[PDB]
């Protein structure tokens, strides 16, 4: 079964009723280890449960195998289980070997319903929903954002008729529509933090900290799924307007907290680095100027000279930069960015300030959190690496608190270093012309780089993939093509293949740009793995990221090219 948008309050009340007893804890939350949106949603849930004095346990998780292990290790006193950030696409009942009969408590013939000791709640933004979890199972409860009622009526009817059952033709039509539904790729439709904030608004527990966490969760998706961010932006604007005090005439105090909608820019850590660095290490600026060669640097220098900012002034840190230029920056950009094609740098973002402290924007906060998640600090080595990532999750969690600002500064520095390393790797990739072009898709394989170790983490590989996608591919007027990025680690002798969906030119509203692009790589990878024999791993939550043995990549890519299902 699934809960509509208005049933969030009922689900929360059910959780309170069942998993609430000061004698012992009965609530466990499973969280995706490498998702910022899930991190913020779990932080909001943790604060909400702390308010009501609900005993709970929070367990970071990486991959489906660890989910199976931890679920098997769960005690019998867990009345409710929360799956935050995953589980939507897979069959939890079949995957977790959950048999409803062994989970029932009491059955009433008159009521026609059965009570179960354990309950599972799924907070997943990915699509398509697995119809087994939505329409078939009763133990699995899914927090739907309305998609099922909006567009899944026909699939609902088909699945119900399949369950209810010359008849061969009808069964064929129903199974055909079901297969057609299942044949689509996977994308993200909404932010889980938005749903948690909707629940809080329903029960009236919304404040400024919750709004900040919601903003962070929503903006985490801006880099990849800009359509979702554009759809959710007006609500964030309205909520910030509602929660902000009407009068701002009072002078700043040490405890004052500000949350303004100020003009933000598509620049990398503008407020914690130099303007030159902000323009240099930005994906959009590099894409529109090709800063990976000398011509791009010359163009950037010419742009800075025409804006009237001396090179020495530009390289000065943000805090100590000349105040006149800092104040005029908006006008200067208004008049000069259009010449070089950087008209999209102008944007409106959310900036949070604390009394007598520096001001940090939402994008910079998300960047710091992601940097802490990434570089914060056979099967045995893999387990140790995943344990290290689980540990980094808690550094990222701590950074979300206002008392732990040193962690945020460390994360900012690590983000700067990581962006520098990714820029160097991208320069190496593009100069060598390593991006082979096949008709079906692009291919790029890393074998002897200088910083190969950094790319064992899926998040860093995704960062590099986004950098490469925006640069020389989003531009050049080249037909959109999915990209394959692979890296190699000598300590284990295996690959980390990651499929990436193409992106339309940024900030180009169009009917075709309005339509989304689905990620079909999961289906093709699964089909190839099932047909072939290469001992591939699809344990990662992001089904597009797999681990491949050193020898099998060439046959795997041959089969991928011959499949034509990308």
């Amino acid at each position: 079964m699934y809960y509509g948008i208005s049933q969030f309050s009922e689900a929360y009340n059910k959780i309170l009723r069942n998993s609430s007893s000061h004698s012992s804890c009965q609530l466990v939350i499973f969280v995706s280890c490498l998702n910022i949106d899930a991190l913020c949603a779990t932080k909001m849930l943790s604060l909400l449960f702390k308010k009501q004095l609900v005993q709970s346990q929070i367990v970071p998780i990486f991959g489906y195998s660890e989910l199976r292990r931890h679920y098997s290790q769960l005690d019998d006193n867990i009345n409710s289980l929360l799956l935050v950030g995953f589980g939507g696409v897979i069959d939890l009942e079949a995957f977790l070997e959950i048999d409803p009969q062994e989970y029932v408590i009491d059955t009433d013939e008159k009521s026609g319903e059965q009570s179960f000791r354990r309950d599972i709640y799924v907070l997943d933004a990915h699509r398509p929903w697995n119809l087994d979890n939505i329409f078939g199972s009763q133990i699995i409860q899914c927090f739907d954002d309305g998609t099922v009622d909006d567009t899944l009526g026909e699939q609902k009817e088909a699945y119900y008729k399949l369950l209810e059952l010359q008849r061969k033709k009808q069964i064929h039509e129903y199974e055909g529509v079901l297969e057609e539904y299942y044949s689509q790729g996977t994308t993200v439709v909404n932010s889980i933090s938005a749903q948690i904030y909707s629940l809080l608004s329903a029960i009236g527990e919304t404040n400024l900290s919750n709004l900040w966490l919601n903003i962070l969760g929503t903006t985490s998706l801006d880099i990849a799924y800009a359509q979702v961010y554009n759809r959710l932006y007006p609500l964030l604007q309205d909520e910030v307007k509602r929660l902000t005090p009407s009068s701002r005439n009072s002078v700043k105090t040490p405890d004052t907290l500000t949350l303004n909608i100020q003009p933000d820019y598509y620049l990398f850590l503008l407020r914690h680095s130099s303007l030159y660095d902000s323009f240099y290490y930005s994906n959009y600026v590099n894409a529109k100027l090709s800063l990976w060669n000398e011509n791009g640097k010359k163009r950037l220098h010419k742009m800075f000279a025409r804006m009237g900012i001396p090179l020495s002034t530009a390289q000065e840190t943000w805090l100590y930069m000349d105040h006149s230029i800092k104040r005029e920056l908006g006008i200067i950009f208004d008049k000069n960015l259009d010449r070089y094609g950087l008209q999209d740098i102008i944007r409106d973002g959310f900036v949070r300030t604390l009394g007598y402290r520096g001001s940090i924007s939402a994008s910079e906060f998300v960047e710091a959190l992601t940097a802490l998640l990434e570089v914060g600090n056979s099967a045995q080595k893999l387990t140790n690496l995943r344990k290290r990532w689980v540990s980094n999750f808690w550094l990222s969690w701590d950074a979300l608190d206002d008392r732990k600002v040193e962690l945020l500064n460390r994360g900012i520095q690590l983000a700067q270093d990581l962006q520098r390393a990714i820029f160097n790797t991208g320069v190496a990739i593009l100069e060598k012309k390593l991006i082979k072009h096949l008709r079906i898709y692009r291919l790029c394989v890393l074998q002897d780089g200088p910083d190969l170790d950094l790319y064992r983490n899926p998040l860093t590989l995704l960062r590099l993939g986004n950098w490469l996608i925006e640069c020389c591919a989003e531009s050049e007027d080249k037909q959109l093509l999915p990209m394959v990025l692979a890296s190699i680690d000598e300590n284990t002798d295996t690959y980390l293949v990651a499929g990436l969906t193409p992106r339309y030119p940024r900030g180009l509203d169009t009917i075709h740009t309005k339509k989304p692009i689905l990620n079909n790589f999961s289906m093709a990878f699964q089909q190839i793995t099932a047909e072939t024999d290469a001992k591939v791993r699809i344990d990662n939550f992001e089904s597009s990221i797999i681990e491949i043995r050193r020898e099998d990549l060439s046959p795997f890519l041959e089969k991928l090219t011959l499949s034509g299902l990308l």
Binding site: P254, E316, T317, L319, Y320, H323, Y356, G358, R403, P450
Partner: protein, 594 residues
């Protein structure tokens, strides 16, 4: 008018700032007043955060705004300390981009700038005027003047008939402060192409004096001003804050400066069961092998203990190491690393050195026509290590000037009417090549070493490094170098340069171990055995070029004491004696036997 408002704004900033629940500057001022430290250190980021207008005012006209800030600080201090005190000093800290010393020009006149350099000279403290009492010659009119040390003041030209300049200062009623002059050079790596390093004149006041010693890299925050010594002005820097990576206060004083959190980090590190391996691996990580030489360098850095007997006799406590080997042994790289890591060190070339360069030089002042003594590498590197590269290239005359420095740790000067005995407590790490550039086994050791025995006896450990062509070692070294070229453990197997330097300083200032009776007995037995072996090894044709005297016994004792000091152990046991004996056998007896 405006000055009062500026003072009020600064007072409000001092009395209102807070980042969580502690008034940082209020409490800091109270604590400083408690210990008679009339100053206040302000972080400019906090000032920017509190109010950007105040920072703009401070940056626009520092020379006119800073005195108002000092007055505000004094008023707040009087409010906080006295229940109804000279003018307080303002020390600034900033993280702005450092301007290269050579990039300072007209554009930076009368502005706050941050730069780093090397201090090459310091002056004797002078006396400045803050409160002057004056009296007129004719009518005897008492008057007072208050002077700030920031220059964009003079005795009145007209009395308050009296002639021009009628006021005479009454000294016994005036108040003065301390002043010092420093010479700052630019970092060698930052010098432009084919240019001599540039010097800059700087001044410090009150609590910023006696903070730096010559030869130490520092970071300076100050005002780039000018003074008229006709259409030109001599540039200079008015120091507002000094930041250095070496605790100079703890070096020239028996007092030691280390935070409680530091002291407890260095104790935990010392508690490590295998600190010796960590330090051995932490020296020259980019050099393959040479483990024994790395251990010798560790011992030299740690040093031994010095004893002053009741009769006045003094025993040396510094360890000297010589490296005689073939080309490509990486001796010069080891010397450079030693110079980089030691708290105090000077890297000098034997070729490019002189007798007067390396000890002290009689210099005549151009103006006073009086002779003074400047200092050389062995006075500038007092309390540290002197890396004398190309030891063999040094002339005899030059060389001979080093003996007393090495052994007696003093410099005796009798020149131009100057009779003094300077102090040079240094350790000498020298590298040299044989006579023919390689150690030819066909010829006797005496023919391969031109060094007289007198100089060699002073070196505690002598390493004769010979390059042997072994395929396995050659392949290993090639792989290591290739990995270096094409290419951070920090997992307890190695500590960075800064931590090692701080630990060296702490160990030197904290521990001075002593030998146990068993160690003394074992050492005497080993010394007798070594001397007997040397006597046996003698051949009628020639006498041993490598000597074994009482100095070698003292050197072994020093090595044992340094090994004990490494672990902060107050006593040296047989465990350290064994390692010292092994090192001596591996280096000095190895050189002598050949």
């Amino acid at each position: 008018d405006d000055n009062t408002e500026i003072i009020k704004s600064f007072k409000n900033f001092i009395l209102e700032f807070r980042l969580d629940s502690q008034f940082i500057y209020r409490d800091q001022l109270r604590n400083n007043i408690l210990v008679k430290n009339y100053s206040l250190t302000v972080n400019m980021e906090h000032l920017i955060g509190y109010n950007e207008d105040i920072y703009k005012k401070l940056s626009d006209e520092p020379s006119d705004i800073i005195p108002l800030f000092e007055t505000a600080i004094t008023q707040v201090a009087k409010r906080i300390s006295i229940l109804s005190l000279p003018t307080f000093q303002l020390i600034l800290n900033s993280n702005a981009n450092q301007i290269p010393l050579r990039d300072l020009d007209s554009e930076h006149v009368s502005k706050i700038v941050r730069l780093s350099g090397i201090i090459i000279s310091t002056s004797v403290l002078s006396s400045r005027a803050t409160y002057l009492s004056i009296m007129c010659r004719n009518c005897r009119h008492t008057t007072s003047i208050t002077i700030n040390n920031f220059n964009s003041v003079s005795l009145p030209r007209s009395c308050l008939n009296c002639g021009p300049d009628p006021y005479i200062i009454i000294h016994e009623s005036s108040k003065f402060i301390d002043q010092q002059f420093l010479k700052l050079q630019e970092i060698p790596e930052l010098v432009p192409v084919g240019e001599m390093p540039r010097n800059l004149t700087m001044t410090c006041d009150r609590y910023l004096t006696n903070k730096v010693i010559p030869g130490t890299r520092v970071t300076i925050v100050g005002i780039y001003s000018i003074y008229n010594s006709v259409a030109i002005r001599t540039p200079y820097i008015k120091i507002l804050g000094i930041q250095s990576d070496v605790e100079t206060s703890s070096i020239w004083n028996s007092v030691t400066m280390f935070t409680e959190e530091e002291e407890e980090e260095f104790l935990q590190l010392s508690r490590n069961p295998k600190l010796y391996e960590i330090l051995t691996n932490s020296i020259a990580p980019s050099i393959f092998g040479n483990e024994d030489i790395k251990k010798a360098i560790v011992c030299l850095l740690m040093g031994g203990s010095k004893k002053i007997l009741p009769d006045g006799m003094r025993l040396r406590g510094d360890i000297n190491v010589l490296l005689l080997g073939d080309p490509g042994t990486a001796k010069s790289q080891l010397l450079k690393f030693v110079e980089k890591v030691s708290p105090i060190a000077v890297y000098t070339s034997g070729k490019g050195s002189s007798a007067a360069g390396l000890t002290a030089s009689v210099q005549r002042d151009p103006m006073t026509r009086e002779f003074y003594l400047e200092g050389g590498a062995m006075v500038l590197a007092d309390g540290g290590v002197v890396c004398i590269d190309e030891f063999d290239k040094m002339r005899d005359e030059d060389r001979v000037a080093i003996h007393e420095a090495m052994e007696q740790q003093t410099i005796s000067i009798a020149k131009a009417g100057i009779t003094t005995v300077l102090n040079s407590r240094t350790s000498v790490l020298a590298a040299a090549n044989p006579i023919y550039g390689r150690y030819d086994d066909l010829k006797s050791p005496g023919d391969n070493i031109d060094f007289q025995t007198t100089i060699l006896s002073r070196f505690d450990m002598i390493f004769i490094v010979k390059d042997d062509h072994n395929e396995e070692r050659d392949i290993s070294i090639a792989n290591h170098v290739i990995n270096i070229h094409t290419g951070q453990e920090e997992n307890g197997s190695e500590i960075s340069i800064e931590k090692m330097k701080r630990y060296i300083t702490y160990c030197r200032l904290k521990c001075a171990p002593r030998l146990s009776p068993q160690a003394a007995e074992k050492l005497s037995s080993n010394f007798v055995t070594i001397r007997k072996q040397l006597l046996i090894n003698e051949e009628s044709t020639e006498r041993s070029s490598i000597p074994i005297t009482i100095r070698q016994l003292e050197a072994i004792i020093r090595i044992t004491e340094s090994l004990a000091k490494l672990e902060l152990s107050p006593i040296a046991q047989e465990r350290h004696v064994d390692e010292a004996i092994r090192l001596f056998q591996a280096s000095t007896m190895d050189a002598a036997s050949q």
